[PDB]
Amino acid sequence: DEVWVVGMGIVMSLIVLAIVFGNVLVITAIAKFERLQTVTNYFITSLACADLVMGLAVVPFGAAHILTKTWTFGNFWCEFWTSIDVLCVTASIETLCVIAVDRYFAITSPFKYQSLLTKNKARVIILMVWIVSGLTSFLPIQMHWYRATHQEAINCYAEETCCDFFTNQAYAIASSIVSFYVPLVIMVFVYSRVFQEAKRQLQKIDKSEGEHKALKTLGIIMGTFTLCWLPFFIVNIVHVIQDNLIRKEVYILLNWIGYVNSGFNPLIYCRSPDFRIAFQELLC
Numbered sequence: 690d691e692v693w694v695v696g697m698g699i700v701m702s703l704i705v706l707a708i709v710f711g712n713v714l715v716i717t718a719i720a721k722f723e724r725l726q727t728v729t730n731y732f733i734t735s736l737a738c739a740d741l742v743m744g745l746a747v748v749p750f751g752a753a754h755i756l757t758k759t760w761t762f763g764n765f766w767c768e769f770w771t772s773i774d775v776l777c778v779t780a781s782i783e784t785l786c787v788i789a790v791d792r793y794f795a796i797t798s799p800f801k802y803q804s805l806l807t808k809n810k811a812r813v814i815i816l817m818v819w820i821v822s823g824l825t826s827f828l829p830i831q832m833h834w835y836r837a838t839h840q841e842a843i844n845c846y847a848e849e850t851c852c853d854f855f856t857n858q859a860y861a862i863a864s865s866i867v868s869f870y871v872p873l874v875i876m877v878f879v880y881s882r883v884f885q886e887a888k889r890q891l892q893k894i895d896k897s898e899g900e901h902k903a904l905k906t907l908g909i910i911m912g913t914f915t916l917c918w919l920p921f922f923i924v925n926i927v928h929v930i931q932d933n934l935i936r937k938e939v940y941i942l943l944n945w946i947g948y949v950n951s952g953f954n955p956l957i958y959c960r961s962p963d964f965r966i967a968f969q970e971l972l973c
């Protein structure tokens with residue numbers, strides 16, 4: 690019906706607009722002002738770059754493919770799109786992992802933070818993260834190593850309209866392990882100790898002078914990442930392990946839920962008063 694196609698297009702355009710506007714302002718504010726060029730603001734720059742690439746490339750063409758129902762572009766041009774999707778998702782999650790580790794290294798070892806993070810080490814860390822993300826998205830896909838053998842997969846591969854995702858078991862497990870689960874475990878172990886230290890400091894202060902803030906901040910941090918990406922990475926292995934228990938539509942919906950996370954990062958991370966002033970003088 691014409692109601693559905695017009696109605697969904699508005700949402701799929703608002704998502705792109707929100708992502709682009711949110712992720713361009715942070716980059717502009719960091720670049721144009723010498724106050725915010727901190728060693729810990731480069732990771733946010735990399736995260737914003739990944740989110741911007743997602744907004745410019747991943748979302749609009751997927752929306753057009755869904756609305757039109759046929760991939761009018763060539764067969765070559767959409768393997769590039771799939772590789773871009775995987776690369777951007779991996780580089781976005783691993784950047785959050787790196788930010789968490791950097792935050793951990795500053796509280797438990799206050800006397801060594803300035804002498805163990807340096808502007809030279811940040812570049813190396815970012816380059817390693819992006820390289821690791823790049824050797825799990827372009828190399829294994831454009832070499833045609835992930836393709837399945839079942840009849841539907843080949844019958845759809847041999848058509849210039851088909852670009853639906855059919856993946857092998859080993860790739861489906863390895864990609865998920867590299868992208869999500871190891872960063873999830875690392876982030877959990879990192880963020881438990883920060884809460885423990887906050888509790889210790891509060892208890893130490895209370896005795897001498899005589900915590901909703903810690904729970905609220907950690908909830909905002911870890912209830913938007915464990916709720917947006919976890920449901921997808923549980924079915925990403927399930928639909929491969931056991932026959933066809935998972936429908937294609939549920940897979941697609943849980944995938945598009947994960948793209949929305951790219952539009953929330955500036956709100957979660959760029960809330961400091963310095964960022965507020967920087968945004969205020971950029972506009973208005």
Ligand SMILES: CN[C@@H]1CCc2c(ccc(O)c2O)[C@H]1O
Nearest residue numbers: 771774775778854864865868944
């Ligand atoms: C086209 N959508 C892709 C399909 C599979 C996949 C995604 C993201 C990270 C991964 O590690 C994946 O294996 C999704 O963004």
